[PDB]
Design a protein around this ligand. Sequence first.
Ligand SMILES: [Zn+2]
Ligand SMILES: [Zn+2]
Ligand SMILES: [Zn+2]
Ligand SMILES: [Zn+2]
Ligand SMILES: [Zn+2]
Ligand SMILES: [Zn+2]
Ligand SMILES: [Zn+2]
Ligand SMILES: [Zn+2]
Ligand SMILES: [Zn+2]
Lengths: 112, 108
Amino acid sequence: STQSHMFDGISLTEHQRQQMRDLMQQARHEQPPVNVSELETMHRLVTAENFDENAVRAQAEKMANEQIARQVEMAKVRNQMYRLLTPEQQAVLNEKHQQRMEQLRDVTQWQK
Amino acid sequence: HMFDGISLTEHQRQQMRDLMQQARHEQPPVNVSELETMHRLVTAENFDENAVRAQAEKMANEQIARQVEMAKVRNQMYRLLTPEQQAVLNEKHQQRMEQLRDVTQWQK
Ligand SMILES: [Zn+2]
Ligand SMILES: [Zn+2]
Ligand SMILES: [Zn+2]
Ligand SMILES: [Zn+2]
Ligand SMILES: [Zn+2]
Ligand SMILES: [Zn+2]
Ligand SMILES: [Zn+2]
Ligand SMILES: [Zn+2]
Ligand SMILES: [Zn+2]
């Protein structure tokens, strides 16, 4: 899923938005477009009378081992978008990120 | 989502919510560490494809365990259902599948 609102709280000259959106949808491209297949077999497994954990694990690992490519590509794009920014815009980015992290930890502790 | 369109006694509704909480228990927490080193990679002046790969995988593991535990519980819930309800679920499943398919050839 897109990082957007990734440039929330950030703006971001208009040519910067041009260069951004072009191509940020290339980051909407090579996102994860699921199969009716993955979904059908997943469904069959989940709906089964007795559960086959090893099967579902197998299917998960396949799916992931797949996505990894996309993951990497979209990471590349993201990095480009990042490089297209000013150290202060960046500052704000890294701040947003760090916030997000803290939130995640708070949630970890609460659910611990 | 997966029950979208099924109901469903209060007793069993609470069973399922109970199971849901205890599931947000048995499942792996978001490894904020890997997230750190990832953001860190993504924001470096020069980009290390292989490094990023290493991290992607290193996270993949938690991703998998999540999928498996989530399926474990979804299946527990399905078990809780009654024959009727399970059939309704099949209805919704097939509808969903239709929409999906009919769309996966659109516009073609
Ligand atoms: Zn089916
Ligand atoms: Zn299903
Ligand atoms: Zn696949
Ligand atoms: Zn906090
Ligand atoms: Zn605990
Ligand atoms: Zn950080
Ligand atoms: Zn990040
Ligand atoms: Zn990991
Ligand atoms: Zn387990």
